[model samples]
Target chain A: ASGLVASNLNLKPGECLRVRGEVAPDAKSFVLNLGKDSNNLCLHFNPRFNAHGDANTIVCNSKDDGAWGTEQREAVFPFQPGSVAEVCITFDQANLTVKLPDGYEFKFPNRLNLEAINYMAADGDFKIKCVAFD
Target chain B: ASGLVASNLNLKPGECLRVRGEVAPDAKSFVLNLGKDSNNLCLHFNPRFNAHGDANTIVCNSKDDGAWGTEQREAVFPFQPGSVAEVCITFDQANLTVKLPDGYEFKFPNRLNLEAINYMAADGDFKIKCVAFD
Candidate 1:
């Protein structure tokens, strides 16, 4: 994971983070990290289709105390690194949902139970076109 | 002004335009235009500083029938190309307000009160890092 952090987000619950960009055409995998710091991660949404030797899987988990939590895998792969795309992530109390540009919703458990996350980051392989939280 | 056009916006009232980027380190001027087409601009907000032979002038006007309307100039400029910035434009019935990345508001009259505009363009000397409308 590249761990390019965009901090001071102050992302509130019921709000959403919208990103428009492209995955690297040769990307292996990418991670969306919502957390307070590098070690304390709230949610790790990793879409592993070909990389990590997985077959179209969305791996969601969390990390705390320098340890990762349980992995929640789902079968939803609707992205290619070369196309124009949009991803909207909405934050709630119990879960954070990822909405694909083509109108599909994928859920990730909020293990940290965060009221707000001030730090936001994207790691791995992607080129960002637009990123907004509103 | 370097007006890069992002199409299929279809921006409407009660909606907003948000831009996050940095000005050219030596940016002289910039313009944000909303309209049906480049030739049929509804709102043109131009912030000029040491540009067009002026010092700190925000020129606002509309172009219809290939003719320019009255020039409404304001005195608000808070952008440095080397620094990160965000700009928000809110559309209303009578006027459009430009909110600076900081906490300043500049208003411009909406000459064309058509229901909505489908095209948006930004021209001037700036490096856009992020752009979104919702």
Candidate 2:
């Protein structure tokens, strides 16, 4: 796992945050927080991953933790301009899970069980707004 | 939930698939799956949602299923030219999980434990490749 949930927000344990942002008008490739965290324990999407024209998609995924273990997984997403989204994170013991604007899901083990992490930052051409909860 | 994951790899009752693809040189706001699911039970990303310049991003997320329920979340992704990624999916009864390149994770309750849904289509300018495993 490349580890480190950078970009939208520098990740920590025990805390949850929601990242909101839009796509670029003339952008191409972009990055998310999935560099490490294997086991399908991350989140991602690519509208062009399937179909074309009107079939443009919003393919998504999650970590299964394997058939009998808690292995990490990965999910990478791709979008375009005016591409707005919402990332909601929740902490559960060693579980670090996340969500998107369209019902997509991803998860990982905090392993660190960090708390009170509310730092939000942007690393690209998009605009982000993060909020923590109870 | 849109109730159906209609991009990249189709959902089934008992099967898994891996989807691969790249972004367009001149695309914007592409769609992935995540039409009906909730709880961040879906996946989506936006690269331009953070900083500017070399600060481009690839934001991701997953559903924590919530604190007291198997609630669905969402994860949306954004990409550009040559933005290639890997999405691995596995089935576990009512659990439909997924993973992406650079290690992103997303999860959801098949509520429908889909199996053998190998149909994939594109909804935008991105290209994709999908395969299955045991």
Candidate 3:
């Protein structure tokens, strides 16, 4: 179920985007992206259940012109396979704040500095149940 | 986009099901159903912006053996066209409680008396973005 894509979101600063989904039973990792397209992203949120030599880690990064930026990792993990989990993200000009399912908070730089983002996508071992902006 | 269906839910009593979606700009009404199937629904939640001689009403009912029961209508309408809205529902053996997007609460009888429900679907002018059970 990695085929979810939403466009023309008009998601601005001060608004929150919430995603709720079920992690696959044998999941490795899943990613959520917000940007203008596949080649340019302001935020790349990845949760590694057991992937990229990391177990139970949340990694955040950015992509610019098809080039990936440095990764920022958070150690708190509150996700379980075959269960529902939610993440809420809000961003400003300088930083993006993510509230994990377990109420843990992490921040990453909003490198692109865009006023609003219009594209969102999800990939890997997660089946999205819902997406909302409010 | 009236083609959403989820089966084998196994949604039990005391659990909350949350749905968030965007309403069509020219919406008339939308409905969310829960039960075993289309013919044996335990809950039929319909928000009528303007349909069936009703405007700005939240109507709830049940279906038994393909026969519809009495309709319960709530007059507090907090939904807007072309905007996102959410509803959270929790039920016991006797009644189903719904928390609307505006934080209003409403209750309807759980006529089916089933311990758990295994099906869910949405239809009409609503484009469901997410469905989560917790």
Off by over 4 Å in 3: B1-134
lDDT tens digits, residue span B14-103, model 3: 988887878888888888888878898888988898999998888889999899999988869898878988899888899988999989
What DockQ do you compute for every candidate structure? 0.10, 0.02, 0.11
TM-score of each: 0.53, 0.30, 0.56
Better of 2 and 3 by TM-score: 3
Give stretches of model 2 more than 4 Å off.
Answer: A1-134, B1-14, B32-81, B113-118, B130-134
Question: RMSD to the native, candidate 3?
Answer: 7.9
Docking class of 3: incorrect
* Clash totals for all candidate models: 6, 131, 1
Candidate 1, A47-111: lDDT as tens digits: 77477777657787888867899988875678776676678888887888889767889887778
Candidates, ranked, TM-score: 3, 1, 2
Candidate 1: stretches off by over 4 Å: A1-3, B1-134
**Residues B8-105 of candidate 2: C-alpha lDDT, one tens digit per residue:** 22344444455555555554433343312333233343343233332344433333343122334345553445566556666565555666564666
* Worst 10 contiguous positions by lDDT, candidate 3 chain A: A1-10
Top-down lDDT ranking? 3, 1, 2
